Design a protein around this motif. Structure first.
Motif, PDB file in Angstrom:
ATOM      1  N   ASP A  93       1.108  -0.884  -0.113  1.00 52.74           N
ATOM      2  CA  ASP A  93      -0.125   0.109  -0.075  1.00 52.74           C
ATOM      3  C   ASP A  93       0.796   1.239   0.177  1.00 52.74           C
ATOM      4  O   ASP A  93       1.765   1.641   0.996  1.00 52.74           O
ATOM      5  N   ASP A  96       0.400   3.615   3.546  1.00 52.80           N
ATOM      6  CA  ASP A  96       0.784   3.155   4.379  1.00 52.80           C
ATOM      7  C   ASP A  96       1.859   4.060   5.127  1.00 52.80           C
ATOM      8  O   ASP A  96       3.206   3.797   4.507  1.00 52.80           O
ATOM      9  N   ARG A 147      -1.604   6.227  -4.325  1.00 49.82           N
ATOM     10  CA  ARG A 147      -2.614   4.998  -5.172  1.00 49.82           C
ATOM     11  C   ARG A 147      -1.845   4.336  -6.391  1.00 49.82           C
ATOM     12  O   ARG A 147      -1.911   2.901  -7.177  1.00 49.82           O
TER      13      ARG A 147
ATOM     14  N   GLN B  48      -5.037  -5.502   3.399  1.00 55.80           N
ATOM     15  CA  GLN B  48      -4.599  -4.361   2.703  1.00 55.80           C
ATOM     16  C   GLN B  48      -5.455  -3.681   1.935  1.00 55.80           C
ATOM     17  O   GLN B  48      -6.251  -2.935   1.712  1.00 55.80           O
ATOM     18  N   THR B 121      -8.495  -1.394   2.529  1.00 54.43           N
ATOM     19  CA  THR B 121      -9.797  -1.576   3.350  1.00 54.43           C
ATOM     20  C   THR B 121      -9.044  -0.275   5.012  1.00 54.43           C
ATOM     21  O   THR B 121     -10.162   0.189   5.300  1.00 54.43           O
ATOM     22  N   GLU B 122      -8.657   0.906   3.901  1.00 55.51           N
ATOM     23  CA  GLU B 122      -8.203   2.180   4.839  1.00 55.51           C
ATOM     24  C   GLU B 122      -7.698   3.401   4.158  1.00 55.51           C
ATOM     25  O   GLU B 122      -7.394   2.730   2.934  1.00 55.51           O
TER      26      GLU B 122
HETATM   27 CA   LIG Z   1      -3.784   0.015   4.467  1.00 60.75          CA
END
Ligand SMILES: [Ca+2]
Ligand SMILES: [Ca+2]
Ligand SMILES: [Ca+2]
Ligand SMILES: [Ca+2]
Ligand SMILES: [Ca+2]
Lengths: 355, 345, 346, 345, 49, 98, 20
Positions: A93, A96, A147, B48, B121-122
Motif C-alpha cells: 500500500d 501506509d 495508489r 490491505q 481497506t483503510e
Molecule cells: Ca492500508
C-alpha cells in the motif's frame, strides 16, 4: 494529370507496442546506519519507475506499468563484529506509514515476506503484484493519489542499533509490463533528508545582537551549535554544497524585518546558500522569494528590497528578527532553483556527487 | 493464496429514538469501510484490499402501527458524493437506484449490488485523500417525517467480502473529536491585554457572555471529563507574540492544552505549542516559555505576550495527542476519556 | 433496463480558435475528456455515477486557407494528469504518443480515439481529493506545428458513444475558480509607504512599473469580466496584516480580496479582507472598521492603523469566488452575475 | 531473454523553413543512432546492441503547389561514407539506391531496407572510433533548389527495432559546442607583450579588428549566455610560458575559462589549465598561478608570461567541463546554458 | 564465462563491493561515485560485503 | 425539405459556416457566438469551409401544421411551424464569399 | 486528399409537379 492548390502529407498515426521488461538496479544506498536508534527506518522508498535508473529510463516512454515481479536484495557492509539487527519487508500500500519504529517492527513483520536478520546477514524478498495496472508517474495536475502510481513501499527498520559502521544497500530485480506509449520529461530531483540521526540543523534568532542569527547551524544533539562548514554540511546531507544550493523548507519560518517607520513580516520558505566574505566562502541562511529580483534571496535586512505603492524599489530595513527553528533527520528538503523550480535529477546528480 | 472469504453480520448503528430527530436529518449517513462492523473490521485490519461480494442492510424499527411518519433509505454508489444537507437530502437520495420508503412501523432489509472492484481497506495515511479508492459509497437512512411516538431504530449489516494482501494496522492512528452541543463555542481572547484571562480557553454560549472553561462545562461541550493531561491539536494555528528586554518572538499556538493551577486543586486550558527546549507541548505563558539562544543556552527572557482572538464551533474537529505530540489512538482515547457508547463512529 | 444505458451523440467540444495568433508548439486545443465537456453528454451523465467511453471520434475542423502554409500536430495523451511541455518541444513529445499525426491547416480530420474499456466516474469528486485519474481517460490535444501565416480558424466536435451506469442525480454542487485572462501584467498589494491612502488596496501593475487603481474596466481586462460591489474572492495564500491602536495589537490573515463601496457608494474599490468573527462575514481589513471581541464579550474597534504585507498575484494564481462568509458560488450563478466572453471549453 | 522488440515513432527533425537554405545544403544529414529519437533513445540506452527491423522516414512539407523547387532524399548504407559537401552532394546521394526527388509541396514516406546486422547502440568510449559498428548509415534530405516561398519541413521516423544485452548509460558523457555564426572568430593574442589584453579571449569579425569578449557578443557567437563558471576544453592546447626571478615554467593552456573582474560586476575569458596546486582549472595569470617546489611547499614565483597567438573558427568544437575537468552532460548543459530548442542534435 | 570473485579480507573488515560484467568492450563506467548503480544495471551484477 | 446552402467562392477563402435545423418552433438559439455550439447539438449539424457548398435534408415530424399564424387568441407558435433553419457564421470569411 | 482552386455547388435542377 491535374495540379492542385496543395497535396496533404499522408495521414499517418504513430503506432507503438507494449513490452515486457526485466532488469535490475541499485534502488537505494545508505551509509552508517549506526546513529539511527531502534525503530528508525533507514530505508523506506516508495516503488516507482523513477527510483531505478534503467527501469526509469524505459518507463519514461510509457504511460502505464504493471509490476509482475519485484525481488529485493538487502545487504549491509557492516562486518560480522557489528551487533544488532534489522527487519526488512514490503508493504502493499503506497499510502501506509508505519508505526513510530519502536513498534513498527512487529507491524512490518505482519506484512508477508518480511524477514528479521542480524546486520551482517542479508535478506531477499520476492514480491508479486499481479493484475494491477499503475501509472508510471505521480499526477502532475490534480491531487497526488499515491495508489495510482505506486504498488507499495519497501522498508528496512533498525531492529537493534548497530554497534559499528553499518552501511546498507537495497537492489531490486524487477520484471514489468509497460503500456500506452508516451514520452515524459526528465524526473525532478526528490526530497532530501539527513544521512545521520545524531545531528540537527537549527536557526536561532534570539540574541538579536548576534552576528550569525539568521544562519543555519548544525548542532550535535549533545552540545552547542557550530557554523555550517561545507565539510559539516556534507557529513549531515551526504554531499558537498555549492554557491547555488537552494532547498525548500518543510514548514516556513516567520521573520520580521524592520527600520524606523517601516515594518514587514516575511515567510521564510527556503534555505539558500550565499557568499560569505568577498566571494571566497559560502554560508547558509533563511530565504524567501523576492518579488523585486524575482529570485529566492537570503533575508538580510540591508539586502532585502521591496516595492512601495509608487512601484519603486527600496531597501529600508535595518534590523530583523528570526523565529527559532529546528530541523532533523526526519525532515524533507526539496532542492529547487533560485526560481523555486524543481531541478531535474541528472542536474542535481552532476552538481552533487554523493560522498 | 493469503486471501480469504469472510461471511458475517454486525450491528452498524445502535438503537436510537427516531422521535427525537427532525424531518430531513439522517439517523444514518455512513461511508462503508470495514472499520464500522466489529467482526468485519477486526479481520480486515489484517488485509490491505477488499471486495464486497454482498451487503444487506437491516433497518429495524420496533414500534406499533400507531406511529405516524416514515423513513427513506438507500445507497449512493460513490464515496465522493455528498447528499445535500437539508430536507432536500431525501428526494436526492430517492433518485439513487436503491430507494425504500416505509412507515416507521415497517422494518426492512435492503440488498445493495456493489461494484466488484477491489478497494483499499483503510484511508490513505500518505499523499492525497482519494476517497473513492477505499469506499464504495455511503448508506443512508433519513427521517422523511418525524415519528409520532417513540420509535427505536437500529441497523445491522449482513456482509460477505473477500480480503487480499496481508498487512496489519491498529484500530486508529488518531481520533478526531468535536463538540456535543451546538449552542456554545470555545473562545480565546487576547484583546484586553492587561486581563489575566487572556490566552485561556473559555466557553461562550453564543448569545451569553463567555466564561472560564471548567471541567463541569467541558463535560457538556465535549461529552467527557477533562484532566491533568488533556491535550489537543487545533485545526487552525493561532498566532502569539512574546516580548521582553531586547527580545521578541512569534510563536504559533498549535494546541489547546490543560495545565493545573493554584497548587493543583483546579485545572485550566490554554493555547499551547511544542517547546523545542523541553520537547513537550507547553501552555505559552511568557515567563514559562523557554528558548535556545545561538550559544545553545536556555533562557526565559519573555515577560509580555499577545494572543490573537479565535473562535471554535461544534464544526471544529480537535485531535487528541499526548504531550510530545504523539496522536493518541481511538481505543486508547475512549479508555482514558470515556463518553456515552454509541456505535456508528 | 434502467441503471444502465447506451448513449450516442455529437456535440461541440471546442469553439473557434485562430491559430495564426499562437506561438509555435503551443496547444490550440488541450482538453481533458469528462462528460461535462459536451452539452448533451454532460447533462445525461449527471444522472449516473460511472461511464464507459466506447467510441470517441474527434472531428477537428481546420478551416485555414488552402494556400496558407504550415500544419498542426494532434494527439490523445492517455493520462488525465500528464502535462505537455510549454515549448516547441511539446510537439515531438506528442508525436511520440500513440495515434498522433500531422496534417496541414486546411485539412480537417476525424481522428478516432481508442479508449480503455475501464469505467470512470462521471464527475469530479465533491468529497475528498481531486484524483483526476479517477474520472478522466485522458487529454485531447492540438498543437501548432508551424504557426500559420494568415487567419486560421479551427474548431473541434466530438462523436461520442458511451455506457452510463449506476443511477443517481448530482446537485450539481459545482463551483468555479478564476485566474487572470491576460499575462502581460499582475495585480498587487502594498504596505509601504505606511502613510499612503492605497495601503492594502489591490492595484494592477503592468509591465510598465507604476501601479494603478481598478477603473474597474481595468479589472475587466485582467479577469475578463466586470466587477460588482458584491464581488469577493478567496486568495491562494493569506497575507499578514497587523492591526494596532491605543495599547492594542492584533494579527490577521487576509484570506480574501473583496470589493467594497467607496466614498458614498457611487464608487467601488478592492481591499484585503478576512472573515470577521463579530460581523460573521467577510469585511475589508480597515483599522477603524475592523471590530473584535474582548474577554467580557463586548465588541470594539480600537484599531487606528494597519500594516499590510506586500504581495503580488499573477495569471498563475487561482482565485475562487465566494459569497460573503466564503460560501462557494455555483458555476451557473457566477457565469450569470460575472459573464466572461463565451468560449468553449471553459 | 532480456531482449525486446520495440515499435514506435518519433520526430527526428523539428520544423524548419527550407526557404532559408541554399541550393546544395542539406536540411538533414543524420547518422542513424538510437539517441536521435526520444522514445527509441530512452529505451535503447538500457541495451547494448540493436537491430533495425524497420525504418520509414516521413518528410513533410506543408506548403502550396505555388512553391517552386524540390528536395532530394535518400539513405547511404555505410556509417563511414561522407557525402561531398557542395551542391555535388545531390547527384552523389542520388546514386544511392533509395533516392526520391519531389517538389517542395509533395510530402513523402521513405522505407529503408537496412542490413540485418546487430549494431552497438552507442559510440565507443574507449579504443578507436570504428564508426561502422554502431551506425547503419546516414539519412539525408538535401535542397535541390531553394523553395520559392516559405515551405516548412519536418522529419518523423517510424521505427521498429530489437534490443539486446542489458546495460544502462546516460544521455551523454559530454557535449561538444561550436559557434552559431560563421563570420566571426575567437582569438588569443600574446604578441604585444606589454598589453593588458594578452591571453584573454576576444572576438574578431574576420574583416574587422578584434574586440573584448563580452556576454552580449558571446551570446551571438555561441547561442547562449556565459556566466561565472563557464569553462571549456579547447581542441588544440596553446603554449604558455611563465617566468620570474630564477624561475621559468612552460604550461599548456588546455581550457578557455571564465573568471570575474573589477569586484565581480563583469566577467572575462582567459586561457586556462588545471592547477595541480588547487586541483582546479585556473586562468594562468602569472601572479595567480601556484606551483609546488621539490619540498612540496606552494609558491607563486611568476611575474611575467607569454601567450602564443591562436585562432578559433565556427569549425572548432569546444567541450564544456566543470572546473576539476569533469565534462558536463548534455541534459545538464542545456539546463545550465540554454539555447534555442531545435531537435536534430 | 564464469567469474569467481574472492577477497581475503577477514570478516572483521567493513565495507563492500559490486561486481559485474559489461557486454561492451568500449564502455567506460561513470566515475565510481555513481558507477555502482550503472554496473548494477548490467545483468548478473551483484553487491556484496 | 432539403436546404441548399451555396457559397460560390474559392478555396482561398478561410473560415466556415455551421448549419442545422431545430425541430421546435418555440426554441430560441442563444443570441451570441454561443449560438453555434448550441445549434451543433441538434441532430442535423453541418460544418463546412465557406468554399464547400452543401445540401441538407431534414426529417420533419409528420404532423399537420396550420399554414398561417393565429390571427385570434394566443400565439401558440408550435402549431404552424416545425422549427427554424439556421446558417451561422462560425468564422468570418477571409474574402468575399457570396 | 488534394485541395482544388474551387469546388462547385452540386448541380441541382429545380423540379416540380403538376396538380389537379
Ligand atoms: Ca492500508
Ligand atoms: Ca503518467
Ligand atoms: Ca459520482
Ligand atoms: Ca554501449
Ligand atoms: Ca389559416
Amino acid at each position: 494529370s491535374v495540379a492542385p492548390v496543395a497535396k496533404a502529407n499522408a495521414l499517418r498515426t504513430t503506432s507503438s507496442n507494449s513490452i515486457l521488461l526485466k532488469g535490475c538496479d541499485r534502488i537505494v544506498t545508505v551509509v552508517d546506519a549506526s546513529t539511527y536508534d531502534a525503530g528508525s527506518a533507514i530505508v523506506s522508498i516508495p516503488i516507482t519507475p523513477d527510483i531505478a535508473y534503467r527501469l526509469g529510463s524505459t518507463a519514461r516512454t510509457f504511460q502505464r506499468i504493471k509490476y509482475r515481479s519485484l525481488k529485493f536484495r538487502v545487504n549491509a557492509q557492516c562486518a560480522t563484529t557489528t551487533a544488532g539487527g534489522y527487519v526488512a519487508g514490503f508493504v502493499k500500500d503506497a499510502a501506509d506509514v508505519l508505526p513510530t519504529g519502536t513498534a513498527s517492527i512487529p507491524y512490518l513483520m505482519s506484512n508477508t515476506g518480511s524477514f528479521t536478520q542480524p546486520w551482517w546477514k542479508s535478506t531477499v524478498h520476492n514480491v508479486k503484484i499481479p493484475q494491477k495496472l499503475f501509472y508510471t508517474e505521480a499526477p502532475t495536475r490534480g491531487a497526488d493519489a499515491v495508489r495510482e502510481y505506486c504498488p507499495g513501499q519497501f522498508h528496512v527498520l533498525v531492529d537493534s542499533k548497530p554497534s559499528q559502521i553499518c552501511p546498507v544497500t537495497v537492489d531490486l530485480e524487477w520484471v514489468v509490463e509497460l503500456h500506452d506509449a508516451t514520452f515524459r520529461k526528465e524526473s525532478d530531483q526528490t526530497a532530501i533528508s539527513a544521512i545521520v540521526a545524531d545531528h540537527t540543523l537549527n536557526v536561532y534568532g534570539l540574541p538579536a545582537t548576534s552576528n550569525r542569527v539568521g544562519h543555519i547551524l548544525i548542532s550535535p544533539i549533545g552540545q552547542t551549535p557550530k557554523d555550517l562548514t561545507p565539510t559539516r554540511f556534507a557529513t549531515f546531507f551526504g554531499f558537498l554544497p555549492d554557491d547555488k544550493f537552494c532547498v525548500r523548507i518543510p514548514t516556513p519560518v516567520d521573520v520580521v524585518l524592520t527600520g524606523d517607520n517601516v515594518y514587514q513580516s516575511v515567510e521564510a520558505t527556503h534555505i539558500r546558500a550565499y557568499l560569505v566574505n568577498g566571494g571566497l566562502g559560502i554560508d547558509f541562511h533563511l530565504a524567501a522569494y523576492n518579488d523585486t529580483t524575482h529570485t529566492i534571496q537570503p533575508i538580510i535586512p540591508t539586502l532585502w528590497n521591496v516595492y512601495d505603492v509608487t512601484g519603486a524599489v527600496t531597501a529600508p530595513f535595518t534590523s530583523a528578527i528570526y523565529d527559532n527553528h529546528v530541523w532533523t533527520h526526519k525532515d524533507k528538503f526539496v532542492p529547487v532553483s533560485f526560481q523555486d523550480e524543481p531541478i531535474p535529477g541528472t542536474v542535481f546528480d552532476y552538481l552533487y556527487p554523493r560522498s
